[PDB]
Design a protein around this nucleic acid. Structure first.
Ligand SMILES: [Mg+2]
Ligand SMILES: [Mg+2]
Ligand SMILES: [Zn+2]
Lengths: 94, 117, 38, 136, 111, 141
RNA sequence: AGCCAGGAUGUUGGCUUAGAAGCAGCCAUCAUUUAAAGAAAGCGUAAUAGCUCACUGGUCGAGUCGGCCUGCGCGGAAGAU
């Protein structure tokens, strides 16, 4: 029941990822199955309110990006140590 | 304060008794003490308390929303405080006189006796 | 009245409104709770 | 109080406090206390902060200690000259990074737990913050 | 007034300084000299002391000689190497702490 | 009864012939008549029942002597004679000493029906269930 | 948020106490009357009483209440020619 509006990452690496946190974005990745992994960027203000509910980690979510809808599940979420922020979220196809 | 679903408990209980109702009587409970309310409670002690009311549906967006079905006397009743009461039994007998004869003690406010069916 | 530093709201009658460049603590019911310098 | 029983070596030189902390989440407890700032925390501070948490909610609720000093930290005398070896061991210190969970709490309500951590926050030299369960 | 004066109350036994002793030395006069390091406060000569080990008091007394090196100064501040010895104290062990405290009288009033 | 000005309340014992251990001269500072006690109060005291606590309501300003209105018996006394042990416990609510039956506190609490707000007779039993929960006395309905 | 009323009966809840009656503590914190009222948030009494808040009614009337992450400030900030 969850719709995540996202875009495909043009740039990559440490220098690229820190520029996204200045613009209220954060890096991510959708992997699993026979398909190759793809680096995706998510908006912080929209996503940060969702994982407060317990249904985010249990129920299946649908990441909308360029008219795809991969339909993935949450695996591992890296948080920023000394603030309430998100660093990187792993996704698995299902 | 209760939300829309829980508010309908007071509405549907009043709306069903519009067609089936018999008599109603009003009084100003404003400026009044709980001991002045206890006079009507000990009046209902013979009748067991379930039959009688004075149960305040007195908001203009609660009881006056359930009035427009049938028997509209609440056009000019609106302003100030009103004590709504509805009974399935009941005659047009002495029940008015207890409120009238109590006016020796003043009874705080009687709402100038507006009157109901 | 004390000065100390932190205002610390104790009772329901506590006010906490700024006057000139230095905020004060005003309490009508309890004059002991009056404070400055926060 | 709260020091090593035995030590492999008596003295540590000095050391640096760099990088970020290890435990981003609370493993054992339901709530806890995280340190935002950076600095040296002596063994007397965590003893004093624990004494506030010892008597706050009486019997109900349990507390854990996720930190420990294990750093000798020598101190010289006053009128002595420089050199003539290193000073003797006086008090123990826990070096901690930003994002380290110092204390934890389980069997206390949410609103009551904020009061307990507020008292322990003033005992510590650096700024601190509240944390949730954070399962994943 | 005569009655109020008669009273002799001292209500303060606050510590003047607290010091831990280490590396005992031997002296002919007092029988022992316990090397000390003051962690807090200032140690004084004629002010009484409380010697305790593991939170319980092993011995009690009043200082007779406060001596650092050959100086024999009457006062020692905190975090300054210090020396101590007393009569009628047989056993000096490391890890114990000596608590020195000043004695003051509050005074009394009648009512 | 119209307005609150001057009243006194205290439980006295009717077991003896004209007793005043609790009050004596300390009945009231307003100047209550001591002679009127045996004349007025003892008329309806011995006529009903003796042994239990008997409260009082006194309203005198310039009348010297007086009369009295009917009263209601308390519930805490009905947990002594018509319940378990009369002495007490000492231990908190953690440990449960006594117990209650369904037959008890049904027709015993009916004697309080003189002056109560509660309309329904079945509702009077449920009010005493909460009262026994203070002590923690288990009841088997 | 003001103004205009109530703010309770059983019940001094049990227990500890010289006495604590909702308000020094401990445990339980329900059930009637109910518009609505917590066996009690604070002041007060030797202890009752008294007077308020929560909750809810009338009046008036459309934005209101409390947090989280930050831009840049306020106090904290007292020294000798
Ligand atoms: Mg000015
Ligand atoms: Mg500044
Ligand atoms: Zn105040």
């Amino acid at each position: 029941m969850f719709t995540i509006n996202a875009e495909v990452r043009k740039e990559q690496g440490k220098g690229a990822s820190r520029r996204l946190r200045a613009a209220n974005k954060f890096p991510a990745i959708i992997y699993g199955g026979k398909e190759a992994p793809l680096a995706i960027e998510l908006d912080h203000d929209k996503v940060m309110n969702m994982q407060a509910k317990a249904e985010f980690y249990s129920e299946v979510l649908t990441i909308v990006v360029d008219g795809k809808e991969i339909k993935v599940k949450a695996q591992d979420v890296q948080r920023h140590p000394y603030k309430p922020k998100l660093q990187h979220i792993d996704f698995v196809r299902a | 304060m209760a939300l829309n679903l829980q508010d309908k408990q007071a509405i549907v209980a009043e709306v069903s008794e519009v067609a089936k109702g018999a008599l109603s009587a009003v009084v100003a409970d404003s400026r009044g003490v709980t001991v002045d309310k206890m006079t009507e409670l000990r009046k209902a002690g013979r009748e067991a308390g379930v039959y009688m009311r004075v149960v305040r549906n007195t908001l203009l967006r609660r009881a006056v929303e359930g009035t427009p079905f049938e028997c509209l006397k609440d056009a000019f009743v609106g302003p100030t405080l009103i004590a709504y009461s509805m009974e399935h039994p009941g005659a047009a007998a002495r029940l008015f006189k207890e409120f009238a004869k109590a006016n020796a003690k003043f009874e705080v406010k009687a709402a100038a006796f507006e009157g109901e069916l | 009245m004390k000065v100390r530093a932190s205002v610390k709201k104790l009772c329901r009658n506590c006010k906490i409104v700024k006057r000139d460049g230095v905020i004060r603590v005003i309490c009508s019911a309890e004059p002991k709770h009056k404070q400055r310098q926060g | 109080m709260l020091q090593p029983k035995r030590t492999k070596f008596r003295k540590m030189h000095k050391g640096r406090n760099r990088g970020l902390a290890q435990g981003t989440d609370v493993s054992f407890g339901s709530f806890g206390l995280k340190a935002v700032g950076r600095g040296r925390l002596t063994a007397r501070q965590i003893e004093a902060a624990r004494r506030a948490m010892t008597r706050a909610v009486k019997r109900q609720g349990k507390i854990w200690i996720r930190v420990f000093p294990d750093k000798p930290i020598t101190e010289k005398p006053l009128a002595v000259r420089m050199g003539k070896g290193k000073g003797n061991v006086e008090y123990w210190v826990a070096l901690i990074q930003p994002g380290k969970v110092l204390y934890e709490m389980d069997g206390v309500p949410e609103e009551l737990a904020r009061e307990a951590f507020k008292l322990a926050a003033a005992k510590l030299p650096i700024k601190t913050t509240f944390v949730t369960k954070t399962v994943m | 007034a005569a009655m109020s004066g008669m009273l002799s109350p001292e209500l303060k036994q606050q510590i003047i300084g607290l010091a831990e002793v280490r590396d005992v030395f031997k002296s002919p006069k007092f029988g022992a000299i316990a090397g000390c390091m003051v962690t807090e406060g200032v140690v004084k000569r004629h002010n009484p002391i409380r010697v305790l080990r593991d939170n319980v008091v092993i011995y009690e007394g009043e200082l007779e000689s406060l001596r650092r090196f050959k100086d024999d100064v009457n006062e020692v501040r905190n975090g300054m190497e210090c020396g101590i010895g007393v009569k009628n104290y047989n056993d000096v062990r490391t890890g114990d702490v000596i608590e020195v405290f000043e004695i003051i009288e509050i005074q009394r009033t009648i009512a | 009864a119209k307005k609150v000005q001057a009243y006194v309340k205290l439980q006295v014992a009717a077991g003896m012939a004209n007793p005043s251990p609790p009050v004596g001269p300390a009945l009231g500072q307003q100047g209550v008549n001591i002679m009127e006690f045996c004349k007025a109060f003892n008329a309806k005291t011995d006529s009903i029942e003796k042994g239990l606590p008997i409260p009082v309501v006194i309203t005198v300003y310039a009348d010297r002597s007086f009369t009295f209105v009917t009263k209601t018996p308390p519930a805490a006394v009905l947990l002594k004679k018509a319940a378990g042990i009369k002495s007490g416990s000492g231990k908190p609510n953690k440990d449960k000493v006594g117990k209650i039956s369904r037959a008890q506190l049904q027709e015993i609490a009916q004697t309080k029906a003189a002056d109560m707000t509660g309309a329904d007779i079945e509702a009077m039993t449920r009010s005493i269930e909460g009262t026994a929960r203070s002590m923690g006395l288990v009841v088997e309905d």
